[PDB]
Amino acid sequence: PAYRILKPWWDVFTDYISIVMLMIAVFGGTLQVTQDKMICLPCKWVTKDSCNDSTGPTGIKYDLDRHQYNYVDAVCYENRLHWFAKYFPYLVLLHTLIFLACSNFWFKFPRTSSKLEHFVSILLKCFDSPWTTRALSEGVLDKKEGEQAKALFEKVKKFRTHVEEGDIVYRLYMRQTIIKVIKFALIICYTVYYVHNIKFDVDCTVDIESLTGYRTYRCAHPLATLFKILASFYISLVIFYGLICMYTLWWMLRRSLKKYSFESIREESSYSDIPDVKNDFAFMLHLIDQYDPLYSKRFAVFLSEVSENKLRQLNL
Amino acid sequence: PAYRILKPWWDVFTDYISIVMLMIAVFGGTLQVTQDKMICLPCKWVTKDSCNDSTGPTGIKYDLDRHQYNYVDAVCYENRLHWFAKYFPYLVLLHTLIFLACSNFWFKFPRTSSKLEHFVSILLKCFDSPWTTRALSEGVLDKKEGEQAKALFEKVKKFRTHVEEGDIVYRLYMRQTIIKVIKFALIICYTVYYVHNIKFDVDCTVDIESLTGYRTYRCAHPLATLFKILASFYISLVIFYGLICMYTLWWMLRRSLKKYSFESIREESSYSDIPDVKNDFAFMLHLIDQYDPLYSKRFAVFLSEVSENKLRQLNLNNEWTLDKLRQRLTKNAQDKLELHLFMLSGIPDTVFDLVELEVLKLELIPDVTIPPSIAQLTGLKELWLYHTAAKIEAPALAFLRENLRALHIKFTDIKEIPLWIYSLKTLEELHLTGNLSAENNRYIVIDGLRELKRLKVLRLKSNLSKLPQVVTDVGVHLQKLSINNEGTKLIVLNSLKKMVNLTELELIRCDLERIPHSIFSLHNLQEIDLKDNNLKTIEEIISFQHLHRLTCLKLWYNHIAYIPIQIGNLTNLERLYLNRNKIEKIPTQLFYCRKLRYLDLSHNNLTFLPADIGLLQNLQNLAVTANRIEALPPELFQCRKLRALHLGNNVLQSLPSRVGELTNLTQIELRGNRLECLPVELGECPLLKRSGLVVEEDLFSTLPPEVKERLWRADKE
Amino acid sequence: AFRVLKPWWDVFTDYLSVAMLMIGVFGCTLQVMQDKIICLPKRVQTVEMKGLKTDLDLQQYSFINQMCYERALHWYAKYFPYLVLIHTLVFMLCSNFWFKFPGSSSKIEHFISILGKCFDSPWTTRALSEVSKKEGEQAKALFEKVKKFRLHVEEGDILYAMYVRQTVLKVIKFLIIIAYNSALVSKVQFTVDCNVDIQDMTGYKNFSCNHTMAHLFSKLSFCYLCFVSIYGLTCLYTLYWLFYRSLREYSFEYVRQETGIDDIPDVKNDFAFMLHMIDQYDPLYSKRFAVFLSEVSENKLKQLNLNNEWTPDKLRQKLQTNAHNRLELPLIMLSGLPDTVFEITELQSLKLEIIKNVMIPATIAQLDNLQELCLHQCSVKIHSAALSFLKENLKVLSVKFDDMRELPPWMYGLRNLEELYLVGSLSHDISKNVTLESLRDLKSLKILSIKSNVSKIPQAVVDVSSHLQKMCVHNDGTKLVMLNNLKKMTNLTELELVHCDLERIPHAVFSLLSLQELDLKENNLKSIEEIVSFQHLRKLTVLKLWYNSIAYIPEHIKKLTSLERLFFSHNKVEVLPSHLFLCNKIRYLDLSYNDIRFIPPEIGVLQSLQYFSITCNKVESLPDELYFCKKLKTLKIGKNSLSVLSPKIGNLLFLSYLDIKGNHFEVLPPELGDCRALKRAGLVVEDALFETLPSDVREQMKAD
């Protein structure tokens, strides 16, 4: 759809960070599905619902079947292992899916998508228009290119009247950015506060004494430590994401993007009559300026009426 | 995509090495996830937390369940296994992802990506341009092809102006290479140091005696040796990667890639004026040199301004074809074939393919160079230079020295006047328009007018203050000198008496107010018009009788208040044009001139028209327009040869019916006047047609309809 | 598309590499399996049989398994699939190494591109039909492309050496793989005897193990050995094809036998190797390419296009006349000479302008009517029958040598040549032009005109002085020196030297005893003092010393009275002497645009004068004795300082031309009617002098 021109460096960076968060989520989910188990051994010496931990050594006999061990593992995994260590991959899946939805909502929502495509089409057509090259070079003009330039001019004026009235695109991008930054804050808060509960050694106390004979067990969570690194490294990515989003917010609060100033371009070019655009068109010119100055400089020539008069008298 | 031209061989090699490293990471990750474990067995004999190692052989009874063994395995794998042997594939994966991000950062970062896309697009389009093929072969050019070549040439210029300012791409590539080599060094250091910790046999003393019964165990890590060789293979690839990066770093320190000299191409190609680009232009050109020098060779002929000039000239040849030039062909005042080339970039060779052209007119063409094929224009005699700096060669000079007898030069600057124009051997007619008086250049622009020994006409619109003596020397053969000065008085000082062959001395806007003796000393003068010279009195006609050849005194556009009666002494004039003056009345003395064939008295204060105007039998045109004249006498109508009677905007009461004596009337103007109704005799004049009878319509309708029908039938038949 | 350069061996090896990669991937997937070795200890502690209680846990068994897998199983049985993967990656990388090199790929693409342009060109089957408009132009363009390819790829030998290198690498890798795999395939055994010392951990020291997939790995190793054997046999055949015959040279002798063209050469090096490659692909391509390689076939194509472009009717349109009244064909900037031109036999003169690289066939023997040849700035070649015929027939030649080599060396083998027009330029080393001094073979040469910057007259002219008669030289600012070469002129009659910068008339001219005329054009003759020997030129009637600087005329004019034509126009003469007009045989005397003060009366002696030009003089007085000379046919006195036309002018009966233009006259007399041969055109004057004749004289004059 050639929407790459509407994605500045922050958008591309956040897209790649969200892709790597997708990879975190899939990897952690696969591990939590396949090999997230718990190895629980009963504490032989019990002191008030706690483990006492007291020539040739001899192994301790627990007199438990392998199925009693599996039952103890399942019960202490469900009851006593903290829910973060069990559902971190699903949470990162949900969070990064919401991040992707926030990033691509204005691309998938028809009201903003239609206007985005309309503006992108005429920006790309004006970027390849021969009259733009001639006027930035500024009479020789073929009849057919003159006709197509006049048609593109009338399209530019009609689409300016069609778009300059509304500001839905800028509002949607704003809302997406605030939702992303507040969700960054929430994710960081809860994940940092809950990352310490992913422990290798967990004491479980589930009271299945009638089915096993023991009450307190000591459990090893083999996939805990790895998840910890994953969680920590996932946290790092979110931090970068948030920082990137922070800059985006600052950018969209640095100056009013609903008013675009052609002041530099109309000052440097001969045409000093270029009008100042407003609202959505202003915001998307600002995004395009964040992509490349030359696109905005070239589209500046299709808005002035002195260039229109010059084109009319050349065509005449 | 199309970025293959941008990536050199080292980028492709590093991409392949990164792919193999990612395969290492994936394989090791699957093995770590699925099959990585420890198989720990307790040491029965423990002496100070160490495995003491002290009929038929029988197995050792450890009295441990399978789940206690699993607990021991998990605890020892977690605690007493080195972090490298566990997280080697994940470290490899992270390193490959960082390497791939660094290698492909500039293709994703928008600021550099826009510049790279622009450069690649216009470079590919110039490579595929047919003008590239024409330039390397150096024609048949389709107009789509020609407009593509011109527009994309302008695109190349605009891209150079757009990209020469910044050097972001080079800086980003340098930073990427530096990061890729410093991370290479860190990877080698930490990987080589910790590669010996991937051991098969591992002793673990984890202190789980309260849960197992033993403190020390001897585990065997099955995916260790394999991991070891994987690490070794990984290290090998990293070394290769590092080596490649160093070469790239060396490639960016051997020469300044921000200064790409076009030396080899500009020596090899004919266009030796290709300017040396700078900054990101130079860097991307160096990258495309690393990919394929043919790209840079085909792009080089699209930057040179000599290629600008040649493409512009050949495009000019392709635009203005011979057929539309023949359609545009016209004729000058001398009824000679002329061609008005206005606002052209050059002279097309289609002009020079002609053989019958006589008047080559060149108007406002910037610094054109005339090719020799002008020698084909066999009938070439005139040449018009108006605001045109002309550059010519020697065969052209030969054909102009044997054929060209006219040269019309119009200029506003000294340098617009070329230095070749003084080497013509047949030059005869010559108008210099523009100031010829300057520092070391007052008549020294044109000092080669001694070399031109056949001049006969010299018109000088030059705002002149003095006349050169060399013109007076040339005047042995020169016959016409008309100097236009826009109101500047020359110092004659009787230096014009070598005008023996001069016949038409025309002082236009001279503002003399007096007649020097050199005017009436020159016996061959026949045309004398002291136009706009503000003569209050004309008193020097008496001394003109030594001059036997005067035949036409067109004294027009002057402040002449009165004509003395001595003007009646003349008889020999024919085209006595005394128009645009302040004559109070025409006298009878003026009609003593019997040889008058043409009489113009337009815009005068004549009180009336006397009868003696009819003393002019041979008179053909008569224009007493814008006077105060009421009646035409019958004597005027005895003259049978009146043709052009511009009598309008007058106070004419009526034309007496004796105008029926008139026969040869051709053109008459009567819009104006006071003629109450048309006499039918105005319709009687045969040579007077509808074009000549410029008359009101109502008084024409007063005539009988059948006479109007006869005139109409004479017009249309 | 590089598939046209992939023979059967390359495709076969590529498919074998794919199969070996499949084997390696399958082996690695088999290696993924957790259960690899199964070990039981040795010497463990109708018949009812009982099992031996080894007294070991499952973890002890697993520990024994991994210990014996690491320390008893051979490394080949554990790492064979990875070695297969590495070997097949090396094979795949080194099998495309000839294709994917930077400099080699461009040559490959160029060869296949122009070879496909051949295989689709109409001129190939057209050329076979020749052997057995637009398409001709495309043929010529493709032929230039073929020559470009010859100069572009044939020089190097990177392709052959690179292919040899990759084939040798394949062969040595195959040898190493076969040797070590066949050596170590015996180590893939099912039953293994493991003797690890883990008696302290398990209780036993000797174990018997089984490798579960040892049979599968043995079958995979044998299949890989078979695949590598086939690969190596294919590579050995590739080496045999590379080195059994010299692939650095390719002979087109098979086409030489098939195609009637024998100019087809034998290309070498990369050209040869790629021709062998496409011969392995398709042998028709080289046979069809050969008809485009030869250059005599290119000459045949050029001749065919020359005949096709210019029909004889177009040549009828081109037919015209020249300065010597001959039938001329103006051919301008042509690619060559068509045979259709020679089909015209009524032709009397040929004009070839900048038509270079042109060879004259025997076909010019068709047109016998030639007398003139204009070979202008064109390097022309020749054929034996053309030499013979143009020796027999051609007589008039007019060449322009813009370049010294653009003068061809064969003008001088002729003898019948009579006229020569040597227009052009020359350098400082004039005497080194042996082309000039071969005109000793010319016997009939009579006209020589050399418009060139010639400073020294060559010894050529000295040799050819016996039969040469006319000289016309335009130096154009170049000083002419070494005038002994003009001294040894003997039979010369005409001499026209223009801008030779001869300060004085040399003794060369007086050494000439039969000079009909002399021209010293644009030569700075300040004084004329060597006329004393001019009496030796009894044939001299013409002395056209015009645009000259002769300040005064001395008595030495009495030396020669046979002088008839006398042009001193634009001379520096101030006063004529009493001694010019003694030579009564003078009829043709010119002083045009001079500045003579006045005419002395001794002009009365020149009675046999028929032309007396003194136009644009300062002469104020014409005495009546020139009006007394009635034999004076032409008499030009224009633009002088005279006053009145002579009333007794009708006495001159034979006065054909009286140019008195621009003279200050007053009134023409009525006796112009008595003049029998004077017209308004003849008496050119300003029109106010024309208007003066009496009315009856107008009636007699309009009727002459």
Ligand SMILES: CCCCCCCC/C=C\CCCCCCCC(=O)OC[C@H](COP(=O)(O)OCCN)OC(=O)CCCCCCC/C=C/CCCCCCCC
């Ligand atoms: C970038 C990060 C990549 C990491 C992503 C990991 C993807 C897969 C992770 C989930 C694995 C699911 C299984 C987890 C528990 C293991 C269960 C188990 O032990 O099953 C046994 C079984 C082995 O069987 P044995 O008992 O030896 O059979 C002998 C009788 N034939 O173990 C397994 O292999 C698990 C099967 C799941 C398949 C997942 C992929 C396995 C690895 C495939 C590697 C193939 C690559 C071949 C190409 C290499 C050279 C190019």
